[PDB]
Design a protein around this ligand. Structure first.
Ligand code: CLA
Ligand code: CLA
Ligand code: CLA
Ligand code: CLA
Ligand code: CLA
Ligand code: CLA
Ligand SMILES: CC1=C[C@H](O)CC(C)(C)[C@H]1/C=C/C(C)=C/C=C/C(C)=C/C=C/C=C(C)/C=C/C=C(C)/C=C/C1=C(C)C[C@H](O)CC1(C)C
Ligand SMILES: CC1=C[C@H](O)CC(C)(C)[C@H]1/C=C/C(C)=C/C=C/C(C)=C/C=C/C=C(C)/C=C/C=C(C)/C=C/C1=C(C)C[C@H](O)CC1(C)C
Ligand SMILES: CC1=C(/C=C/C(C)=C\C=C\C(C)=C/C=C/C=C(C)\C=C\C=C(C)\C=C\C2=C(C)C[C@@H](O)CC2(C)C)C(C)(C)CCC1
Ligand SMILES: CC1=C(/C=C/C(C)=C/C=C/C(C)=C/C=C/C=C(C)/C=C/C=C(C)/C=C/C2=C(C)CCCC2(C)C)C(C)(C)CCC1
Ligand SMILES: CC1=C(/C=C/C(C)=C\C=C\C(C)=C\C=C\C=C(C)\C=C\C=C(C)/C=C/C2=C(C)CCCC2(C)C)C(C)(C)CCC1
Ligand SMILES: CCCCCCCCCCCCO[C@@H]1O[C@H](CO)[C@@H](O[C@H]2O[C@H](CO)[C@@H](O)[C@H](O)[C@H]2O)[C@H](O)[C@H]1O
Ligand code: SF4
Ligand SMILES: [Ca+2]
Lengths: 80, 61, 165, 93, 41, 732, 194
């Protein structure tokens, strides 16, 4: 399964969440941003590695990072 | 707290597209927000974003 | 002389290359009436050839057994033996225009930088100011050096963004 | 006379003598700073890697100034290549 | 086992080695590996 | 469920797709990544793997000797090496038709055979081999050596014989032993073969294992060596009337410095080759006694590296803190090794065409051409690996805090300077080198050859005159006898070097014209560009404005997504992948220049190259098109000849090359969706639905297809050229 | 200091004022590093002393009348004998080379081994028998360094003139005095390009 990590450089925009195609990210409460929100990645077992969230991360570099690793039927998105 | 609104500060963040480059301080959240200094840039990163919230230590007037 | 390169004036192959090349055009002139534009043209090509195949030798162009003029690059060889017109002298000529073009370009770039929206004066070029900076590059070498001996030609290393190592 | 003995003997003698009283102290000083200061100690421990570990017979010479057997086989080796480069050079070249 | 060198191959060696190496040998290797590659864990 | 194929990678082992089978073969010799890998275990595994490669090399060599002896014409070729064609092996093709069986019977045989272009014959003759027994004995010997190394791979992997990491990190000693024993005692040992077997055999006198302990290599014996009168071994050299393998013109010298080449063999003299190995052996042994071991006298490498810091501080901390960097990084060392081996692999090709080191090597044009091209290409692949492993070092094993201010860390500091300056040189070479080819082509098309620009390579001609080339008329150094260098060597190799260099029937310093000037600058463009691609990837291996966390993403990763415009081919694996193409392009130009310069030399039409090469059109019609006339006619509607295999391979190369394009032009997606439709059809098809796949069929990985297409592309470029280089040189 | 290499210039602060012979000449800043400055200073005096001996010997062998500086190691090649002041010395290049090696191998190592960085360039003692240092040594040191910089340059001149003019130092001098404008580096062929 791919590894998704949310760094402290998160602004709680929720854009990466509204971008995940397989419900892998969610918005949990935090205190280091004025939006009092920090995206978490509860179900990285459904991550396909599309990296759509990164294309939706507006912070310098990338607060959300998808490290493509092991590949499974879900990770490879195989309906076979 | 933070560089005066409108002040141009040299970005010190290493992984910043605007490193060694200057930008105007749009605002500085006076709370305990990790990165409070909002800095705007005429140039835009590869993504297309032209702004970013940098920490007080990441900015040098 | 130089590297076994005989002067084209003393190059027999160079002479044959003339004889055979003008014969190949004096055989295409026969299949045409004496006054036809086809023939006026082939006679100009024969005259132009006979002038070039002589302007070259008169310039002391050393050529090998092939009979094709060769050029000398070494400044010492080119200068010492009067072969400066080839490569040597031409070298500076390009360098002057090259630096002229580059200097004028940077002059304009650094003027539009600052000016309002500098990005919209690169697409819709300001032809007036672009025409006031072209001649300024005539004495570019004088101005470029004055900038080296004043530390203004380059930028400080602590103001240029660099990729993470 | 002028047989191989003259050339080989002279070379060996000169190098050994120059390396027993002249460069011997510099040789020792260079060995120390090199192996103790900038260079550290090798063969930390474990395994039959004691082969890389220093021997002992080399560090057993009553010879004053500590001219070890390796030093005698060192300067002498340099000397046996001068005796044979001088004789050989006169042979032809 | 004749002349000088006693290991000079017979004239029929090519008519055996070439067929075996390229048809028989490979089949065994491919089949054996196939089973290992698909071997369950 | 989980499979066992990828034992090292449990992720691949648990992979439900077919990618597990493909990657399992790739990530196989990357132990550093294997599940549960310790540094010591890694070194022990690599050390044993080395033995395995050494077993293959000796087993490979033994096979060549065996087939040359069992199915060859060595004795016949040795009798007439300028008429008989060396036979590599026999063609037992159960598919050959009768005309194929007839046409491939050549070089004196009773069945279809393959002539050899490896040049083993010329080499084995020069070294003393004369009969088929010599080959059989050698093959058995090398086969035994291969068996020994194979046992050693097992022995050094079984507890109590597995070297500790400390032994693997014992550099001072390893270098000392290799330089004195592996390099030196193996050169003096070779002089011992030459002086005792090769030289006597070349003078017609069997000194084999039966009489070597009783045959004096020199008439005087070891007396001159002991008495110091070493000169006695350099008296009575073989006369020009000497015939290799015959006492005719034979002399008595064992070690000399004649220089040049033997008249009949047209190859370096054996005595001069004996004294060379003796001289180099002495240097290697003395050089071996340098680093410190377990006695005392010696140099600690760390001290030398740390003591070399420029006092002006221009190089920062200099080489201080670099010993650990090299000793604790197996990619840094491998890169240096590949760089050194690669460069020397090229020296072998550039010094073996000019100075044939084997008897009757020059005579065999096809061998010469196929040997230059072999090494020059192998060298190029090795060089790509050098930079490749260097980039891996930057990411997998570089500590930015330990290397702080050292020459290695102050390189990334000016990484842009190095990369950008390599860009300017490449553009300058490219814009001009090509512009003066199109300009000449235009003049050729407009029938104005005189107008074409032909710059003279004066700088190279002077280096040639310095060595003694007189054609140019510059009278410089050796060219001027009244000189110091010329007079000094006049009593040694000089008398010969000139005779040989001033003979135009060989390849010692061949006359260069303006055609060579353009191609030489084109070769430079390839060297600089290929370098720029690899250097850029190495410097940006773990850093870049687009991907500042490249080190976190490893070395081989497809892309970072369509984000930031495009991250396609952003991994430092893709600087290698791309550099390979430029490497093939560069070597292509060099091996095409060799072949044409020499085909024109051998056909006697040197003016052909001296003129057609100036313009590019000449390179295609006069070289590729003209020479391809025979190869393509290997099999025509009227019959077939012995060049049929090369014609078939020539086309085969094009096929593999074109197939490589699909994997590079097309990308993973159209194929994936297509595979989905295929999966559906099979599951629905009756009588076929019964049989099913154990592994889910998936399209080739993004990086995988890059290497698969590149392997097809490379294989083509090699087979297509190997066919030309051999069938055009042999056809004449 | 001792003066200014370029009347008007300043700085060379890296070069201390006490340094015997400080005229300020260090354009390429080769003495900035203190360590390098120490070695360069000691080497200069060592070079000066050797240079002064060489220049005197090069002119002496010619002035007294026994040959020239260049044609002196000719005997070892031509196949003759050594000759000091005419007196044939009974040695051969081989024995001379060996005598020199051991002699220099000991004296030079002895000087280098001494670690004072003030007595490694100015040992005095046995090296100052007449004890001339007493009473004032700085001026003598300046004369030693100044006369030596003259000798180091001269020794280069002899080699250069022999390389181009192909004449002995004393003979070349006479040639210049003879026709000054017509016997210079310029009228020689190698010095100037045109
Ligand atoms: C771009 C690189 C380059 C290269 C590869 C060369 C190469 C060469 N140059 Mg040269 N040169 C260059 C740049 C270069 N030059 C530049 C930029 C200048 C302007 C300052 C000169 C000015 C120059 C002169 C005046 C002369 C050469 C000469 C030569 C040739 C012999 C001189 C020598 O030994 O070294 C290279 C020398 C230099 C780079 C400049 C120093 C001038 C040389 C040392 C004087 C030698 C004179 C003597 C006749 C040379 C003997 C050559 C031999 C065949 C007899 C040689 C093939 C000589 C020649 O062959 O012309 C007749 C010579 O006279 N060059
Ligand atoms: C003011 C215009 C300008 C100037 C001064 C330069 C200057 C330079 N360029 Mg560059 N370049 C330019 C435009 C310019 N470039 C443009 C428009 C492109 C896109 C095609 C490039 C693409 C380019 C590349 C790929 C590279 C350079 C490189 C370089 C450096 C190597 C020197 C050289 O040989 O030039 C090289 C110039 C070129 C290769 C192409 C540009 C040539 C154009 C015709 C000149 C620009 C004229 C401009 C339109 C005039 C504007 C006038 C104004 C009134 C409108 C150099 C400092 C090299 C480098 O980075 O060195 C490390 C290099 O790799 N340039
Ligand atoms: C005298 C002592 C000695 C000797 C002879 C060797 C020899 C060797 N060691 Mg070794 N080693 C030693 C001591 C020694 N070692 C010690 C004390 C240590 C402890 C630190 C080590 C630790 C060590 C390690 C960790 C490894 C080796 C390895 C090797 C092998 C290198 C592979 C190779 O093929 O090189 C052969 C190279 C040459 C014979 C000479 C090079 C000449 C160049 C390459 C080309 C010359 C060609 C010539 C000009 C023309 C040829 C024409 C024709 C014949 C084709 C090699 C045979 C490696 C190995 O195991 O490989 C199996 C390796 O992993 N050694
Ligand atoms: C003694 C030389 C040598 C050694 C010991 C290695 C060792 C290694 N290389 Mg390497 N390499 C070399 C030379 C060498 N290389 C050269 C000369 C090149 C230039 C062509 C390369 C280019 C290269 C690349 C691009 C990569 C490696 C990689 C690797 C590592 C894993 C790949 C592997 O070996 O499995 C087996 C490799 C194969 C089976 C190759 C697959 C296709 C080949 C062409 C078919 C050959 C079948 C026989 C491994 C530690 C990989 C790596 O860095 O790991 C992350 C990788 O990305 N190498
Ligand atoms: C015939 C095919 C071909 C050609 C001609 C080139 C040419 C080039 N490649 Mg390249 N390459 C190729 C195939 C090719 N490649 C393939 C198949 C691959 C594998 C994917 C690569 C991968 C590759 C990499 C990784 C790199 C290159 C680089 C380069 C450049 C090297 C620097 C140079 O020489 O500048 C010389 C410039 C020229 C020769 C251009 C000539 C001047 C032009 C044509 C005239 C101007 C236009 C003209 C007036 C009219 C045309 C336009 C008009 C219609 C408007 C060069 C231009 C390097 C690079 O980018 O440079 C920094 C580099 O990094 N290549
Ligand atoms: C760098 C200093 C130096 C060097 C290297 C030489 C070297 C040489 N000189 Mg010479 N010379 C020098 C200074 C020097 N000289 C000075 C300053 C003078 C002026 C007095 C002379 C006057 C002079 C004359 C008149 C002659 C030479 C000659 C020679 C050559 C013959 C050597 C010989 O046979 O006698 C070697 C020396 C000895 C046998 C004994 C002297 C050993 C010294 C004095 C002991 C010093 C010990 C030291 C303090 C501690 C150790 C020789 C190459 C001869 C020559 O070449 O003419 C053909 C010759 O005729 N020199
Ligand atoms: C200051 C500066 C600063 C900046 O920074 C840079 C710059 C400018 C570069 C610098 C400069 C420097 C310099 C000038 C140097 C010089 C050197 C020299 C010349 C030496 C000599 C040196 C020289 C010398 C020693 C000499 C020696 C000699 C001798 C021993 C002896 C000889 C001889 C004689 C008697 C005679 C006889 O018959 C022979 C003989 C025997 C042979
Ligand atoms: C220690 C002691 C102690 C005690 O107590 C005391 C005492 C004894 C006193 C002391 C000692 C001391 C000493 C030894 C000294 C030495 C000196 C010298 C020799 C110098 C030279 C010195 C020398 C020198 C300068 C040199 C110079 C030269 C010159 C200028 C020039 C020349 C020339 C030339 C180029 C060329 C021309 O054509 C000629 C001429 C012109 C001629
Ligand atoms: C004599 C000569 C040649 C000799 C060449 C030789 C021996 C050495 C050449 C060194 C060369 C050509 C260049 C070294 C350049 C190094 C540096 C640091 C110079 C960089 C130039 C810069 C930064 C200037 C850029 C410009 C500025 C700032 C403004 C405008 O001027 C435009 C521009 C871009 C030019 C040969 C090849 C024989 C052939 C015959 C002419
Ligand atoms: C005890 C003592 C002493 C001393 C003595 C002696 C006598 C010493 C010496 C010793 C020695 C005596 C040493 C030596 C060493 C050497 C070596 C150990 C080696 C040798 C050889 C060589 C090195 C050679 C090599 C080679 C060869 C083999 C061949 C050819 C080439 C060559 C030559 C290179 C005295 C008396 C003072 C006193 C006190 C006591
Ligand atoms: C086979 C072959 C090959 C290979 C080779 C190799 C890789 C190795 C070998 C090796 C060898 C096979 C060697 C030999 C050896 C022998 C010996 C080595 C013996 C000797 C004897 C004696 C009697 C001597 C002794 C001694 C010494 C040792 C020291 C000093 C002293 C003395 C002199 C006493 C080739 C490929 C080329 C080809 C052909 C085939
Ligand atoms: C025609 C003859 C030409 C000259 C031939 C001789 C060349 C010069 C000698 C080369 C070998 C030098 O060998 C050695 O060098 C080192 C380096 O300074 C000297 O070392 C000496 O000075 C260094 C300076 O840092 C000190 O650290 C060291 O303690 C001291 O002994 C030795 O005293 C000398 O024995
Ligand atoms: S097209 Fe392929 S290589 Fe390019 S960014 Fe998308 S997934 Fe990556
Ligand atoms: Ca034999």
């Amino acid at each position: 399964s791919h590894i998704v990590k949310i760094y402290d450089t998160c602004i709680g925009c929720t854009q990466c969440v509204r971008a995940c195609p397989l419900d892998v990210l969610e918005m949990v409460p935090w205190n280091g941003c004025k939006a009092n929100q920090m995206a978490s990645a509860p179900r990285t077992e459904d991550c396909v590695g599309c990296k759509r969230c990164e294309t939706a991360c507006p912070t310098d570099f990338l607060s959300v990072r998808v490290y493509l690793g092991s590949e499974s039927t879900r990770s490879m998105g195989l309906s076979y | 707290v933070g560089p005066k609104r409108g002040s141009q500060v040299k970005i010190l963040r290493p992984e910043s597209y605007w490193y060694n480059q200057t930008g105007k301080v749009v605002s500085v959240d006076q709370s305990g927000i990790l990165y409070p200094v909002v800095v705007r840039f005429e140039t835009q990163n590869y993504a297309g974003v032209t702004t970013n919230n940098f920490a007080l230590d990441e900015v040098q007037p | 002389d130089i590297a076994g390169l005989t002067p084209c004036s003393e190059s027999a192959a160079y002479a044959k290359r003339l004889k055979n090349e003008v014969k190949g055009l004096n055989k295409r002139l026969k299949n045409y009436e004496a006054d036809s534009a086809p023939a006026i043209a082939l006679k100009a090509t024969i005259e132009r050839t006979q002038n070039r195949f002589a302007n070259y030798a008169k310039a002391g162009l050393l050529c090998g057994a092939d009979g094709l003029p060769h050029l000398i690059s070494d400044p010492g060889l080119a200068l010492k033996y009067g072969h400066a017109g080839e490569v040597f002298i031409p070298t500076f000529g390009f360098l002057y225009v090259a630096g002229w073009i580059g200097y004028v370009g940077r002059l304009y770039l650094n003027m539009v930088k600052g000016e309002a929206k500098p990005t919209e004066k690169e697409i819709i070029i300001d032809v007036p100011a672009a025409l006031r900076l072209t001649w300024q590059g005539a004495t570019w070498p004088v101005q470029v050096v004055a900038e080296l001996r004043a530390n203004t030609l380059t930028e400080k290393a602590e103001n240029i963004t660099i990729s993470p190592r | 006379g002028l047989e191989p003995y003259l050339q080989v003997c002279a070379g060996t003698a000169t190098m050994l003598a120059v390396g027993r009283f002249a460069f011997l102290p510099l040789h020792r000083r260079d060995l120390e700073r090199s192996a103790a200061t900038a260079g550290p100690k090798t063969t930390g421990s474990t395994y039959f890697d004691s082969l890389q570990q220093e021997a002992s017979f080399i560090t057993s010479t009553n010879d004053p100034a500590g001219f070890t057997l390796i030093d005698t086989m060192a300067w002498g080796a340099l000397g046996h290549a001068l005796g044979f480069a001088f004789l050989a050079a006169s042979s032809l070249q | 086992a004749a002349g000088s060198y006693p290991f000079v191959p017979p004239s029929w060696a090519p008519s055996v080695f070439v067929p075996l190496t390229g048809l028989v040998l490979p089949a065994i290797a491919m089949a054996t590996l196939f089973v290992y590659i698909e071997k369950d864990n | 469920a989980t499979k066992l194929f990828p034992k090292f990678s449990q992720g691949l082992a648990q992979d439900p797709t077919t990618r597990r089978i493909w990657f399992g073969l790739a990530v196989a010799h990357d132990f550093e990544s294997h599940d549960g890998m310790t540094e010591e275990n890694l070194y022990q595994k690599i050390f044993a793997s080395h033995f395995g490669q050494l077993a293959i090399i000796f087993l490979w060599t033994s096979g060549n000797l065996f087939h040359v002896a069992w199915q060859g014409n060595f004795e016949q070729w040795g009798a007439d090496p300028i008429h008989v064609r060396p036979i590599a092996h026999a063609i037992w093709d159960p598919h050959f038709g009768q005309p194929a069986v007839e046409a491939f019977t050549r070089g004196g045989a009773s069945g279809p055979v393959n002539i050899s272009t490896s040049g083993v014959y010329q080499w084995w003759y020069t070294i003393g081999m004369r009969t088929n027994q010599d080959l059989y004995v050698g093959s058995v010997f090398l086969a035994l050596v291969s068996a020994i190394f194979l046992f050693a791979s097992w022995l050094h992997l079984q507890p109590s014989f597995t070297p500790s990491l400390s032994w693997f990190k014992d550099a001072e000693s390893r270098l000392n032993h290799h330089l004195s024993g592996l390099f030196g005692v193996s050169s003096l040992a070779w002089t011992g073969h030459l002086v005792h077997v090769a030289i006597p055999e070349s003078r017609g006198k069997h000194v084999g294992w039966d009489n070597f302990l009783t045959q004096l290599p020199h008439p005087q014996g070891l007396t001159p060596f002991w008495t110091g009168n070493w000169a006695a071994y350099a008296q009575n050299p073989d006369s020009a009337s000497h015939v290799f393998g015959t006492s005719d013109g034979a002399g008595e010298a064992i070690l000399t410095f004649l220089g040049g080449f033997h008249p009949q063999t047209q190859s370096l003299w054996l005595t001069d080759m004996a004294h060379h190995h003796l001289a180099i052996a002495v240097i290697f042994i003395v050089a071996g006694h340098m680093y410190r071991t377990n006695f005392g006298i010696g140099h600690r490498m760390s001290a030398i590296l740390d003591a070399h810091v420029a006092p002006s501080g221009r190089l920062g901390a200099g080489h201080k803190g670099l010993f650990e960097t090299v000793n604790n990084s197996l990619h840094f060392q491998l890169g240096l090794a590949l760089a050194s081996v690669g460069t020397i692999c090229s020296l072998v090709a550039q010094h073996m065409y000019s100075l044939p080191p084997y008897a009757f090597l020059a005579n065999d044009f096809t061998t010469q051409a196929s040997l230059y091209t072999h090494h020059q290409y192998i060298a190029g692949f090795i060089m790509c690996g050098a930079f490749a492993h260097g980039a891996i070092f930057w990411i997998r094993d570089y500590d930015p805090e330990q290397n702080k201010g050292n020459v290695l860390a102050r390189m990334l500091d000016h990484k842009e300077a190095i990369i950008s300056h390599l860009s300017w040189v490449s553009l300058f070479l490219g814009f001009h080198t090509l512009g003066l080819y199109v300009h000449n082509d235009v003049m050729q098309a407009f029938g104005t050859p005189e107008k074409q620009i032909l710059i003279e390579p004066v700088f190279a001609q002077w280096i040639q005159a310095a060595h003694g080339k007189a054609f140019y008329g510059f009278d410089l150094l050796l060219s001027s006898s009244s000189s110091s260098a010329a007079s000094a060597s006049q009593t040694l190799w000089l008398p010969g070097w000139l005779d040989a260099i001033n003979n135009n029937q060989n390849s010692l310093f061949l006359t260069i014209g303006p055609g060579d000037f353009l191609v030489h600058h084109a070769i430079a463009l390839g060297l600089h560009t290929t370098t720029l691609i690899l250097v850029k990837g190495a410097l940006d291996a773990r850093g870049s404005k687009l991907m500042p966390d490249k080190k976190d993403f490893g070395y081989s990763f497809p892309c970072d997504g369509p984000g930031r415009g495009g991250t396609c081919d952003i991994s430092a694996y893709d600087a290698f992948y791309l550099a390979v193409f430029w490497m093939l392009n560069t070597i292509g130009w060099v091996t095409f220049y060799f072949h044409w310069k020499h085909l024109t030399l051998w056909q006697g039409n040197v003016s052909q190259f001296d003129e057609s090469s100036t313009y590019l059109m000449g390179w295609l019609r006069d070289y590729l098109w003209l020479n391809s006339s025979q190869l393509i006619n290997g099999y025509n509607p009227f019959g077939m000849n012995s060049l049929s295999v090369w014609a078939w391979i020539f086309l085969f190369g094009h096929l593999v090359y074109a197939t490589g394009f699909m994997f590079l032009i097309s990308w993973r997606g159209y194929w994936q969706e297509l595979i989905e439709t295929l999966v559906w059809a099979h599951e629905k098809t009756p009588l076929a639905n019964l049989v099913y796949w154990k592994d889910k069929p998936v399209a080739l990985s993004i990086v995988q297809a890059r290497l698969v297409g590149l392997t097809h592309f490379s294989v083509g470029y090699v087979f297509t050229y190997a066919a030309f280089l051999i069938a055009s040189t042999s056809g004449k | 200091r001792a003066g200014n290499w370029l009347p008007g210039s300043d700085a060379p602060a890296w070069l201390p004022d006490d340094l015997p012979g400080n005229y300020g000449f260090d354009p390429l800043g080769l003495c900035k590093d203190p360590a390098s400055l120490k070695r360069f200073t000691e080497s200069e005096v060592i070079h000066c002393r050797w240079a002064m001996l060489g220049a005197a010997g090069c002119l002496g062998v010619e002035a007294l009348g026994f040959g020239n500086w260049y044609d002196a190691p000719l005997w070892a090649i031509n196949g003759g004998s050594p000759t000091w002041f005419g007196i044939s010395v009974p040695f051969d290049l081989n024995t001379l080379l060996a005598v020199e090696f051991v002699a220099m191998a000991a004296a030079e190592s002895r000087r280098g081994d001494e670690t004072d960085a003030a007595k490694r360039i100015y040992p005095g003692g046995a090296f100052d028998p007449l004890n001339f240092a007493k009473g004032d040594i700085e001026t003598l040191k300046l004369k030693e360094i100044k006369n030596g910089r003259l000798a180091m340059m001269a020794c280069l001149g002899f080699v250069a003139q022999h390389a181009a003019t192909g004449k002995t130092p004393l003979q070349a001098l006479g040639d210049h005095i003879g026709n000054p404008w017509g016997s210079n580096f310029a009228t020689n062929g190698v010095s100037l390009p045109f």
